[PDB]
């Protein structure tokens, strides 16, 4: 978000995932399988 | 709308403008000769060469003559805040010109937006090179240009696309040159015939005095000589004031670096 | 080390020769004017700073032989390497060829010295410009030369180098004559003092004058002397 | 009596004028009573209320147009009633009828917060000879800026095109800033002034729309003189490097070449550029005929600085004590902004005292503070 | 210069298969969720009108090698690259939907287009050959009128390493020369002088010791 | 200044040009050269140089760009003249070396070839010869001469390391204007005082003052009189007799 | 390779000027002050230490003051490592002069030699300067007492009163007002002390933070007694002048 507006669109949607994954919202019997083609693109809060 | 500049007024009196008159001007007047030949008529042309050679001045001259639509583009006008916006712009502009019948698209100053394609792997040049690509894909198309005559004006051939400078879609490409020792004499006669001067002068003399130079200097040899005219409080221009002015322009050129310099990188 | 400190420029120069000329511009101003039977080098000294020992400190005019003076503008520190080469060549000429040096031969040597540090690798030019003046031996023609950090040498009728040299050079077109020098030694000294008082200003204590007459007589006029010469110019003006 | 004489005529005339217009408000409507009075009734009923703002995208030549309203819905409106179609053409803000939308007329137009930076609200109160001295390199800025507006006659005798452009260049503080604002007081035609630091932005694409605009407004409200103050600022100022950088600098330059000149055939936009990084510009910028006579300024000479210092000490309290000429002696090829700062600093010594007088002592002290600035970011002392 | 785009149009029309015309820069949009939606609707359409060949002209506009982006609007561009790689996976109803792709360079493609399953067969268009050049010249020159003293081998020896766009540009350039002499038939001595006048390069530059 | 140069980090590095950039720059320092004109005939060679006045306080009769290599070979320097201070010594050494080893007047071509072998020795250490330079020389010569084996010859020596034998060549700033006139007015049927007067014709056009012997100098190399520098009194006569015949028009 | 990573720090700036010299001059006002004041009967050299700690031993320290020979001592201000080197170069030069002429060096000659050494490092070889400033107090018969400062460029000027190191501008102003052409050594000692009391970069000014040394004509028979004082003789003359 020194780029375009696209990159804070990314940011809004990413913050939503973290409260889900670990929060006062707790999981469950729900599982994440995450398939990526290169993992060092990622934000390290998605390496967590 | 077509600005009024005579065809005899030109930025350079050469055979180079005659070559233009065979690619652009003549199949609009007569596609009869190019039917008799049967050849496909050439459409594109590159206009290139040093500044002050009246790059855009002969294309205002040719806009007086042909009376076709002129649709002028600035290459720095093709870049917007967000990417793919400018993708919209170019595509749409070309399709409006297809609907239009007997039109010319004059690509001015497409040194940014028209440049070479290359990879940076982290740049911000990629976002610009989307619109660079949008210019290619429209020119070949999947349909031909149905009477769209295409000029590209580049200061620089030093960097250009090699598929915006492939030789089948920019056809004959004309190097515009510096006036000769005869060519400055021609230019400067178009320019001093327009000025009141005291008869018995040499237009040959003033060219010799000058080194190999532009006519945009010869348009300013007159006008600065005209200011030395008003300070002496003369209605007329004489030899003496023309000498001061030749010295004035040349000294300045060296001091900076007006010629044999083109700057940029893309 | 054998890597270049001189990188050729597309302009038709070398950057470091252009940088070396500026460095000379920022230096203290020297005038040279030659009479019919003298030379006169006047130089500005900044004595503006107070509690300066001036007795023990060398003038900005250095004798390099018994009849060849060298004055300089630009980097003061750098200059001393040139003065040590030049004193060394002066003896070498006596050793191997006999007689004292000629002003021309010595000027050429200096020219090749500053030149060398342009063209060689591992070294940057010297930003120091010299006024070399003097007599040839057996002779009584004043010969006044200027060498410059481009390693280009020149003869001159009169010259000035240093800070705001242009202001003095225009004065020298108009008050010194190509055809006639002023013929007394005294008038020549006062013509050069009168010139110095354009840029130097601020009293007569920042003016220093070395006068050389043939037959190997280098004497430098003290402050007191200058004081009298300046006051004359002052009153007449 | 010398102020009063001016006042006595001019005030009484502004008081009468004001009074005149009060009695006169009523009187406007009296030469008609059905000749125009009636016309007014007819237009109004057509218009009704509210007149809904639209934005006109494009016209069609069959008496219709396509508006896009800022409230969303497009409408295929008709150009009918009390409207010329020559006062219509892209970019207009229009009055629509609140039942069936017809364009009843165009009255609305809305100014940008960027045409607000460009357009000036002043006419310069200072005029020429507030840095005066070097007053022969000023008739290269009044024989090519002032004068072809003032006289067409002179350049008609010689015929041909009359002057176009100047680039002012030199040391900083040598008057460049005040030169531009001193010719704008004399000519009295639309004076635009834009800083070059605002031409450099941290966002792309908007860079070119700004530079393309300045000359478009300029040609519209012609004659205009556009002062581009600082075009040395295009290569030294730059924010980030990923929406800044080379790309953004190159594009704004490219844009500026079309404007001046280019193919536009815009209005009169004499140009005044101040610079000192003239070799960070294009060869198609410092091209002749977009620069005509170019002006070099160097530092004033000793007798010039006496012109400069007597302008500045007229506004100040004086004594027989004050001596200008020894202040001149000390400074040696320095800017007249240096000399302008000693006089401004000399009243700072008066202010510090709280004494209303200015003395020779006040000018010499602030000369020492001015020379402290110059040689103390230096630390060589004597040239090493 | 090798007539990448020309070949694909001609051959897909000859043999008949539903020819979808898509230029890759059109997928770039400053909208997402509408620009990205041309991709979505481009499979949905294509599975109805199946078997069909999806011709993307250029594939550098959405075929960015980048997927490590730092501080740019290149994460907007790549969402039409990613959405492409999803529907070029089977969740069936794509076994009969194909891809032709033309591109000017192939060193700019993503590592997820090196792989088979995307474009499996990888065809290079080479610079012309001796036999090939001679042919090319005859196909343009069929359109215009020539004289009967032409030898297509002569012209093809004398052009070496000329691409098909330059060779189109000799054939045209010959009837310019014809027009200027003022004929109505195009000689075999004109095509030779169009070699010099229009190429690709203006001479061998200035040589001062080369 | 600041004109695109992709490569130029090495002092020999390539370059999509196919030739080094640094050598090219060296030739662009000879267009700032004070103009040197030279007309070679079969009866003699005339080297004319504009001494170049810079000031009225500069003594312009003391400074000159005629430089003697030896009695049978003369040479003229234009460009950056500090670079020619080093080479001209070398060339004079060279000639002398030949007279020591062989007791013979050296070929003009051979001598020209020797300062070219010198001209190419820029580098950080490479080839057979140890580099001692690091930046290329920015100076061009016109070595004239007379040998009794191939006659009058005149060579244009480059900072490149290349030599082209000319029949007349002008170099310097006004080079472009000079070579238009040489092309039409030169021929091989000239005589010595018609050439001499041709040097002053072309000198007249590239003159930035006016023509007089206080800023122009002529010099010759003649078979039976050798290399002779023409003094100013003699120079004057010819300049006036041009001015007599140009007033017969 | 190597040429790529080459610093090139010995090239001129656009100003004609040498960035690394200035950077050296910048960093010596980060080292302590050393002052010289020339009396007519002797020379006082007064240095303020750039270190002090109660756990420091600053009593065998002669960390600013060095004897080059028994007639010319120096005050050092700057990077001490570079300085140590020149100090034994100087000793080697003094003894050389003494070997060949069998006569002690004049102050004029040794100051010119050190200066030429410095000049070489800024002139070429791609090195960085030796960032040191020396105040030379010396006696010779030919020109008497002579006082000198040299800087990292390698240029020298004689002075009647000088200050180097920290607050150069400041110390200079003071010196000019409280100097008189001819003084006794005591009056000088006093003045030396007084300037350092107004310029001290900590409020307090003490004996253990003074290195202090003279050269006195209080040696009979026209000889000069070089004295580097013990810090307990400094303590008394500091109570004398009433600072402490
Ligand atoms: N060769 C010439 N003969 C006559 N007039 C000339 C010539 N060259 C330049 N001019 C003058 O220069 C003026 C402006 O040139 P113009 O803008 O048309 O040129 P260009 O070569 O496209 O350069 P640029 O596009 O970089 O401005 C012309 O109106 C004309 O007065
Ligand atoms: N000749 C002078 N007479 C009066 N004031 C002067 C003169 N020269 C300059 N000044 C004053 O100095 C100040 C700065 O000058 P100005 O902006 O006009 O020019 P400049 O050379 O562009 O310098 P800078 O841009 O750094 O301020 C202004 O208040 C100006 O009036
Ligand atoms: N085999 C051929 N036969 C005849 N003419 C040919 C042939 N191939 C190409 N050409 C000519 O060359 C032109 C260029 O071809 P095309 O545009 O298809 O190529 P490309 O390599 O994809 O180039 P670009 O996409 O950069 O325009 C054709 O329109 C035609 O005139």
CB C203 within 8 A of CB C230: no
| Cβ–Cβ below 8 Å for G158 and C24 | no
- Among C200, C163, C165, C168, smallest CA distance to C48 is for C200
Testing ligand 2's pocket by substitution, the residue of D305, D340, D342, D344 carrying the most ligand atoms inside 8 A of its CB is D340
What's the CA gap between E156 and E153, in Å, rounded? 5
Burial class (CB within 10 angstroms; exposed 0-12, middle 13-18, buried 19+) of D173 = middle
Q: Return the residues preceding each gap in chain A, C–N over 2.5 A, or none.
A: none
**Phi, psi dihedrals of residue D215, rounded to the nearest 5°:** -80, -20
Residue carrying the six token digits 């897909």? E12
The backbone torsions φ and ψ at residue C153, rounded to the nearest 5 degrees and listed phi first, read: -125, 155
CB D63, CB D84: distance < 8 Å: no
Q: How far apart are the first and last CA of chain F?
A: 46
Please state, in angstroms and rounded to a whole number, the distance separating the CA atoms of residues C173 and F57: 6
- Strands C158-161 and C30-34, how do they pair? antiparallel
Beta-bridged to residue B73, according to DSSP, are: B107
Does D236 appear as a known binding residue? no
B55 is in an annotated binding site: yes
First to last CA, chain E: 30
Phi, psi for C100 (deg, rounded to 5): -60, 155
Distant-in-sequence, close-in-space partners of D169: CB < 8 Å, separation ≥ 6: D176, D274, D275, D276, D278, D294, D295, D296, D297
> Is D381 annotated as belonging to a binding site?
no
Q: Contact, B188 vs B12, CB < 8 A?
A: no
Q: How far is CA B185 from CA B190, B200, B219, B250, F30, in A?
A: 9, 15, 12, 17, 28
- Calculate helix-pair angle for D336-353, D304-312, nearest 10 degrees: 30
Check: CB of residue F91 under 8 Å from CB of residue F111.
Answer: yes
**How far is it, in rounded angstroms, from Cα C228 to Cα C204?**
10
Residues of C in contact with G3 (CB under 8 A): 3
- What is the domain range of residue G224? 1-244
Could you tell me if the CB of D244 is within 6 A of ligand 2? Answer: no
Strand partners, G150: G134, G156
Interface of F with E (CB under 8 A): 18-19, 27, 158, 160-162
Angle between helices G80-101 and G107-123 (to 10 degrees): 130
**Backbone break loci in chain C, preceding residues, C–N > 2.5 A:** none
Q: What's G34's domain CATH number?
A: 3.60.20.10
**Contact F86/F132 with Cβ under 8 angstroms?**
no
Of E57, E66, E74, the CB nearest to B137: E57
Closest by Cα among F124, F119, F97, F87 to F13: F124
- Is the CB of E23 inside 8 Å of chain B's CB atoms? yes
- Provide the chain D residues 245-284 that lie in CB contact (below 8 A) with chain B: 245-247, 250-252, 254-255, 257-258, 262-263, 265, 278-279, 282-284
Task: Name, in order, each residue with C-beta under 8 angstroms of F207's C-beta and a sequence gap of 6 or more.
Answer: F50, F215, F216
Chain A contact partners (≥3 CB pairs within 8 A): B, D, E
Calpha distance D206→D212 (Å, rounded) = 10
Mapped onto helix, strand or coil, the DSSP state of residue F14 is coil
The answer to whether G36 and G95 are in contact (CB under 8 A) is: no
Contact E208 F158 (CB under 8 A): yes
Helices then strands, each counted (H, E), chain D: 12, 10
If interface means Cβ-Cβ distance under 8 Å, which residues of chain F face chain G?
9-10, 124
CB-based contacts of B242: which residues, under 8 Å, 6+ apart? B206, B221, B225
Q: Is F73 within 8 Å of F106 (Cβ atoms)?
A: yes
Query: What is the distance in A from the centroid of ligand 2 to the CA of D316?
Result: 18
- Residues written for chain G: 244
Which atom of ligand 2 is nearest the CA belonging to D312?
4
In F, which residues are within 8 Å of B212 by CB distance?
176
Q: Is B259 one of the annotated binding-site residues?
A: no
Annotated ligand binding at B11? The verdict is no
- Tell me if E1 CB under 6 Å of ligand 3: yes
Ligand 3: does its nearest atom lie under 6 Å from the Cβ of E102?
yes
Closest CA to F175 of F14, F37, F19, F9: F37
CA distance G11 to chain F (A): 15
Residue D351 alpha carbon to ligand 2 centre in Å:
23
Q: How many domains does chain G have?
A: 1
- Burial of residue C86 (CB within 10 Å: 0-12, 13-18, 19+) is buried
CB-based contacts of B171, cutoff 8 Å, min separation 6: B23, B42, B43, B44, B45, E169, E172, E198
CA angle D133, D135, D137 (to 5 degrees): 125
Q: What is the crossing angle of helices D336-353 and D360-374, to 10°?
A: 130
Q: How far apart are CA G32 and CA G61, in angstroms?
A: 15
Which chain D residues have a beta carbon less than 8 Å from that of B227?
Answer: 143-144, 163, 293
Distance B178 CA to ligand 1 centre (A): 11
Alpha-carbon distance of D255 to D213, in angstroms, equals: 10
Pick the residue from chain B with its C-alpha nearest to E187.
Answer: B37
Asked if the peptide bond before residue E46 counts as cis, ω within 30 degrees of 0, the response is no
Taking CA–CA distances from A4, the nearest residue in chain B reads B82
The whole-angstrom separation of Cα E117 and Cα E101 is: 14
Q: Mark out the alpha helices in D28-152 (DSSP H runs).
A: 37-47, 113-118, 147-150
Q: How far is CA F119 from CA C116, F95, F106, F123, in A?
A: 16, 17, 19, 11
- Residue contact E143–B40, C-beta within 8 A: yes
The pair of structure tokens assigned to C59 is 């003038």
CB-based contacts of E124, cutoff 8 Å, min separation 6: none
How far is residue E191's CA from residue E157's CA, in Å, rounded to a whole number? 13
Task: Note whether D342 and D327 are within 8 A (CB).
Answer: yes
Residue in F28, F85, F125 nearest the CB of C111:
F85
CA distance F46 to F38: 6
- State how far the Cα of B117 lies from the Cα of B126, in Å rounded to an integer: 9
Q: Are B214 and B260 in contact (CB under 8 A)?
A: no
Nearest to E74 among B126, B142, B173 (CB): B126
Task: Tell whether the torsion through CA atoms of G73, G74, G80 and G82 is positive or negative.
Answer: negative
Cis peptide before F15 (omega within 30 of 0): yes
Could you say which DSSP state residue F4 is in? -
Q: Which long-range contacts (CB under 8 A, 24 or more apart) does F19-24 make?
A: F19/E209, F19/E210, F21/C10, F22/C8, F22/F122, F22/F135, F22/F136, F23/F136, F23/F159, F23/F160
Q: Which two tokens stand for residue B53?
A: 């050679």
Q: What sign results for the dihedral spanned by CA atoms F23, F27, F32, F35?
A: positive
How far is CA G90 from each of CA B50, F27, G64, G213, rounded to the nearest angstrom?
63, 50, 16, 20
DSSP output for chain C: ----S--EETTTEEHHHHHHHHHHHSSPPEEEEE-SS-EEEEEE----SSSB--SSSPPSEEEEETTEEEEEEE-HHHHHHHHHHHHHHHHHHHHHT-SPPPHHHHHHHHHHHHHHHHHSSSB----EEEEEEEE-TT---EEEEEEETTTEEEE-SEEEESTTHHHHHHHHHHHS-SS---SSHHHHHHHHHHHHTTTS-SSSSSEEEEEEETTTEEEEE-HHHHHHHHHHHHHH-
- HSE-CB of E12 using CA atoms within 13 angstroms: 21
Closest in E26, E172, E200 to B39, CB measured: E172
Residue F117 tokens, joined = 């072998």
Please tell me the distance in Å from D191's CA to the nearest CA on chain C: 39
Distance B163 CA to ligand 3 centre (A): 12
Kindly state the helix (H) or strand (E) to which residue F156 belongs, with its residue range. strand F151-157
Residue D120 contacts residue D218 (beta carbons within 8 Å):
no
CB D319 within 8 A of CB D358: yes
Contacts of C21 (CB under 8 A, 6+ apart): C127, C148, C149, C150, G16
Please give the Cα distance from D184 to D192 (Å, whole number).
9
Q: Is B52 on the interface with D (CB under 8 A)?
A: yes
Tokens of G227: 């004295």
Q: How many Å from the N-terminal Cα to the C-terminal Cα in chain G?
A: 61
Task: Report yes or no: B169 at the E interface, CB cutoff 8 Å.
Answer: yes
Chain D environment of C202 (Cβ under 8 Å): 329-330
Render the burial of B72-93: b for 16+ CB within 10 Å, e for the rest. Answer: bbbbbbbbbbbbbbbbbbbbee
Q: Report the C-alpha gap between G136 and G189 in whole angstroms.
A: 17
CA distance C137 to C214: 8
- Mutate which of D277, D336, D338 for ligand 2? The one with the most ligand atoms within 8 Å of its CB, which is D336
With H, G, I as helix, E, B as strand and everything else as coil, classify residue E70.
Answer: coil
DSSP H or E segment with residue D180: helix D176-187
Rounded CA separation E149/B52 (Å)? 46
Residue F179 to chain B, least CA–CA distance (Å): 13
Pairwise CA distance, residues G30 & G32, whole Å: 7
Closest to E57 (Cα-Cα) out of E115, E94, E7: E7
E31 chain-B contacts, CB cut-off 8 A: 84
Span from the CA of F77 to the centroid of ligand 3 (angstroms): 56
Tokens representing B158 are 């030093």
SS3 D319: coil
Cα–Cα distance, D145 to G15 (Å, whole number): 35
Q: Is B56 marked as binding a ligand? A: yes
Interchain CB distance below 8 Å, D380 and G22: yes
Phi-psi region of C221 (alpha: psi -120 to 50; beta: other; left: phi over 0): beta
d(CA D191, CA D270): 10
> What DSSP state is assigned to residue B75?
G
Which distant-in-sequence residues (6+ apart) come within 8 Å of F144 by Cβ? F38, F40, F45, F47, F73, F74, F75, F76, F108, F152, F153, F154, F155, F221
Among D262, D264, D288, residue to substitute to test ligand 1 (most atoms within 8 Å of Cβ): D262
Hey, whose CA ends up nearest to atom 19 of ligand 1?
Answer: B54
Token pair belonging to B143: 């349909």
Chain B nearest CA to F111, separation (Å): 34
Q: Is the dihedral of CA C195, C199, C203, C209 positive or negative?
A: negative
Which residues of chain F make contact with D279, given a CB cutoff of 8 A?
1-2
DSSP 8-class letter at D291: S
Mutation site, C51, C54, C122, interface G, largest G CB count within 10 A? C51
């Amino acid at each position: 978000s020194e780029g375009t507006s696209a990159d804070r669109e990314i940011q809004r949607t990413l913050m939503e995932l973290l409260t889900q994954m670990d929060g006062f919202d707790n999981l469950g019997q729900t599982k994440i399988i995450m398939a990526t083609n290169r993992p060092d693109t990622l934000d390290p809060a998605l390496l967590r | 709308e077509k600005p009024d500049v005579t065809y005899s007024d030109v930025g350079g009196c050469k055979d180079q403008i005659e070559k233009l008159r065979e690619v652009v001007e003549l199949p609009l007047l007569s596609p009869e000769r190019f039917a008799t030949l049967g050849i496909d008529p050439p459409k594109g042309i590159l206009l290139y060469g040093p500044p002050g050679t009246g790059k855009t001045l002969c294309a205002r001259a040719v806009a007086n003559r042909t009376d076709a639509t002129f649709i002028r583009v600035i290459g720095s006008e093709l870049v917007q805040k967000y990417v793919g916006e400018g993708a919209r712009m170019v595509r749409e502009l070309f399709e409006m010109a297809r609907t239009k019948k007997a039109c010319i698209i004059f690509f001015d100053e497409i040194d940014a937006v028209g440049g070479a394609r290359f990879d940076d792997g982290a740049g911000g040049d990629n976002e610009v090179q989307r619109t660079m690509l949008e210019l290619i894909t429209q020119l070949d198309g999947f349909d031909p240009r149905g009477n769209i005559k295409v000029m590209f004006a580049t200061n620089r051939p030093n960097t250009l696309d090699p598929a915006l400078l492939r030789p089948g879609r920019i056809d004959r490409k004309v190097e515009f040159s510096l006036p000769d020792l005869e060519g400055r004499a021609n230019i400067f006669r178009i320019h001093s015939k327009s000025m009141s001067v005291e008869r018995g002068i040499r237009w040959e003399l003033i060219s010799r005095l000058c080194p190999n130079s532009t006519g945009a200097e010869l348009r300013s040899v007159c006008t600065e000589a005209g200011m030395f005219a008003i300070r002496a409080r003369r209605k007329v221009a004489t030899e003496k004031d023309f000498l001061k002015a030749v010295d004035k322009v040349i000294s300045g050129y060296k001091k900076f670096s007006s010629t044999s310099r083109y700057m940029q990188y893309n | 080390y054998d890597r270049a400190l001189s990188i050729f420029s597309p302009d038709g120069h070398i950057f470091q020769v252009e940088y070396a000329l500026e460095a000379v511009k920022r230096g203290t101003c020297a005038v040279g004017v030659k009479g019919k039977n003298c030379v006169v080098l006047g130089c500005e000294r900044r004595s503006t700073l107070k509690l300066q020992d001036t007795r023990i400190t060398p003038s900005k005019v250095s004798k390099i032989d018994s009849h060849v003076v060298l004055s300089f503008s630009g980097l003061n520190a750098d200059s001393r390497i040139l003065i040590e080469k030049a004193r060394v060549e002066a003896q070498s000429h006596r050793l191997t060829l006999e007689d004292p040096v000629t002003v021309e031969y010595l000027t050429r040597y200096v020219a090749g010295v500053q030149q060398r540090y342009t063209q060689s690798g591992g070294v940057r030019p010297f930003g120091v410009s010299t006024l070399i003046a003097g007599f040839d031996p057996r002779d009584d023609e004043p010969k006044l030369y200027q060498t410059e950090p481009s390693g280009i040498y020149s003869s001159w009728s009169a010259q000035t180098i240093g800070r705001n040299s242009k202001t003095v050079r225009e004065f020298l077109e108009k008050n010194y004559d190509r055809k006639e020098p002023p013929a007394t030694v005294e008038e020549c000294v006062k013509l050069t003092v009168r010139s110095l008082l354009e840029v130097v200003q601020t009293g007569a204590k920042n003016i220093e004058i070395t006068v050389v007459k043939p037959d190997s007589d280098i004497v430098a006029l003290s402050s007191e002397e200058i004081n009298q010469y300046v006051t004359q110019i002052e009153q007449e003006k | 009596r010398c102020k009063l004489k001016l006042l006595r005529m001019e005030r009484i005339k502004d008081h009468l004028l004001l009074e005149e217009e009060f009695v006169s408000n009523s009187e406007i409507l009296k030469p008609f009573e059905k000749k125009q009075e009636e016309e007014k009734k007819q237009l109004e009923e057509i218009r009704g209320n509210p007149l809904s703002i639209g934005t006109l995208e494009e016209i069609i030549d069959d008496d219709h147009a396509i508006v896009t309203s800022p409230t969303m819905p497009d409408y295929y409106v008709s150009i009918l009633s009390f409207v010329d179609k020559e006062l219509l053409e892209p970019g207009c803000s229009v009055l629509l009828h609140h039942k069936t939308m017809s364009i009843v007329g165009v009255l609305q137009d809305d100014a940008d917060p960027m045409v607000s930076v460009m357009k000036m609200d002043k006419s310069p109160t200072e005029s020429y000879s507030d840095i005066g001295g070097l007053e022969s390199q000023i008739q290269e800025i009044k024989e090519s800026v002032e004068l072809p507006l003032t006289h067409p006659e002179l350049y008609e005798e010689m015929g041909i095109k009359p002057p176009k452009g100047v680039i002012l260049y030199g040391a900083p503080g040598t008057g460049k800033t005040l030169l531009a604002k001193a010719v704008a007081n004399q000519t009295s035609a639309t004076f635009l002034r834009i800083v070059g630091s605002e031409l450099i932005q941290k966002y792309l694409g908007d860079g070119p729309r700004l530079c393309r605009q300045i000359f478009k407004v300029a040609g519209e409200n012609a004659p205009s003189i556009v002062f581009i103050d600082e075009i040395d600022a295009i290569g030294t100022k730059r924010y980030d490097s990923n929406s800044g950088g080379e790309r953004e600098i190159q594009r704004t330059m490219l844009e500026l070449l079309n404007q001046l000149d280019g193919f536009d055939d815009r209005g009169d936009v004499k140009v005044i550029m101040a610079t000192n990084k003239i070799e960070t510009l294009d060869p198609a910028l410092i091209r002749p005929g977009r620069i005509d006579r170019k002006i070099l300024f160097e530092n004033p000479d000793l007798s010039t600085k006496k012109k400069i210092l007597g302008i500045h000490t007229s506004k100040m309290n004086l004594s027989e004590d004050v001596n200008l000429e020894t202040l001149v002696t000390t400074k040696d090829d320095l800017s007249g902004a240096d000399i302008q700062a000693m006089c401004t600093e000399a009243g700072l010594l008066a202010l510090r005292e709280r004494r209303m007088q200015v003395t020779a002592e006040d000018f010499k002290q602030a000369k020492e503070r001015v020379m402290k600035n110059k040689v103390e970011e230096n630390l060589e002392g004597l040239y090493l | 210069g090798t007539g990448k785009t020309l070949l694909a149009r001609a051959c897909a029309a000859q043999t008949n298969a539903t020819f979808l015309k898509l230029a890759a820069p059109q997928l770039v949009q400053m909208y997402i969720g509408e620009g990205a939606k041309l991709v979505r609707d481009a499979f949905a359409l294509a599975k109805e009108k199946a078997p069909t060949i999806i011709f993307i002209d250029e594939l550098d506009a959405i075929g960015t090698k980048r997927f490590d982006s730092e501080k740019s609007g290149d994460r907007e561009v790549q969402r039409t690259m990613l959405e492409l790689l999803n529907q070029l996976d089977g969740f069936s109803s794509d076994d009969r939907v194909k891809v032709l792709a033309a591109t000017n360079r192939v060193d700019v493609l993503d590592p997820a287009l090196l792989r088979s399953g995307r474009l499996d067969r990888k065809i290079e268009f080479p610079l012309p050959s001796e036999d090939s050049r001679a042919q090319i010249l005859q196909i343009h020159s069929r359109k215009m009128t020539t004289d009967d003293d032409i030898n297509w081998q002569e012209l093809a020896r004398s052009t070496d390493e000329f691409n098909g766009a330059q060779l189109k540009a000799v054939t045209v350039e010959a009837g310019m020369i014809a027009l200027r002499n003022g004929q109505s038939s195009v000689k075999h001595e004109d095509f030779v002088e169009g070699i010099s006048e229009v190429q690709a390069r203006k001479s061998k530059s200035v040589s001062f010791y080369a | 200044f600041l004109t695109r140069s992709e490569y130029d980090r090495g002092v020999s590095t390539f370059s999509p040009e196919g030739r080094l950039f640094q050598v090219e720059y060296s030739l662009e320092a000879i267009k700032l050269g004070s103009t040197a004109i030279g007309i070679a005939t079969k009866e003699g060679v005339v080297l004319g140089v504009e001494k170049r006045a810079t000031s009225p306080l500069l003594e312009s009769d003391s400074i000159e760009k005629i430089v003697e290599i030896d009695r049978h070979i003369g040479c003229a320097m234009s460009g950056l003249t500090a670079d020619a201070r080093s080479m001209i010594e070398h060339a004079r050494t060279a000639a002398v070396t030949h007279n020591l080893y062989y007791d013979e007047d050296i070929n003009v071509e051979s001598l020209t070839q020797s300062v070219c072998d010198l001209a190419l020795r820029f580098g950080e250490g490479a080839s057979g010869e140890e580099r001692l330079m690091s930046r290329p020389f920015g100076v061009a010569l016109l070595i004239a001469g007379h040998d009794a084996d191939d006659g009058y010859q005149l060579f244009h020596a480059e900072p490149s390391g290349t030599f082209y034998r000319y029949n007349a060549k002008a170099i310097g700033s006004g080079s472009e204007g000079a070579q238009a006139e040489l092309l039409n007015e030169w021929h091989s049927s000239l005589t010595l005082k018609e050439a001499e007067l041709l040097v002053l014709k072309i000198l007249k056009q590239v003159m930035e003052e006016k023509l007089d012997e206080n800023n122009a100098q002529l010099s010759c190399i003649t078979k039976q009189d050798g290399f002779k520098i023409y003094d100013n009194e003699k120079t004057a006569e010819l300049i006036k007799e041009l001015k007599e015949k140009e007033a017969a028009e | 390779g190597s040429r790529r990573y080459d610093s090139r720090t010995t090239i001129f700036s656009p100003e004609g000027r040498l960035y690394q010299v200035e950077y050296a001059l910048e960093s010596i006002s980060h080292a302590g002050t050393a002052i010289g004041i020339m009396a007519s009967d002797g020379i006082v050299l007064a240095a303020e230490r750039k270190v002090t700690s109660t756990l420091l031993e600053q009593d065998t320290s002669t960390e600013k003051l060095y004897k080059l020979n028994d007639k010319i001592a120096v005050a050092v201000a700057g990077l001490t490592a570079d300085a140590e080197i020149l100090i034994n170069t100087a000793r080697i030069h003094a003894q050389n002069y003494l070997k060949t002429y069998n006569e002690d060096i004049p102050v004029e000659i040794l100051v010119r030699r050190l200066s030429d050494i410095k000049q070489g490092y800024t002139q070429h070889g791609g090195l960085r300067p030796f960032g040191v400033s020396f105040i030379y107090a010396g006696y010779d018969d030919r020109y008497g007492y002579q006082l000198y400062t040299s800087n990292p460029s390698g240029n020298y000027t004689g002075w009647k009163a000088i200050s180097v190191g920290a607050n150069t501008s400041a110390a200079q102003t003071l010196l000019q007002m409280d100097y008189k052409d001819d003084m006794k050594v005591d009056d000088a000692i006093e003045l030396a002390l007084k300037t350092l009391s107004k310029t001290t970069d900590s409020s307090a000014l003490t004996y253990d933070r003074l290195e202090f040394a003279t050269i006195r004509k209080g040696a009979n028979d026209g000889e000069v007694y070089q004295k580097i004082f013990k810090p307990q003789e400094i303590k008394d003359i500091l109570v004398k002048t009433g600072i402490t």
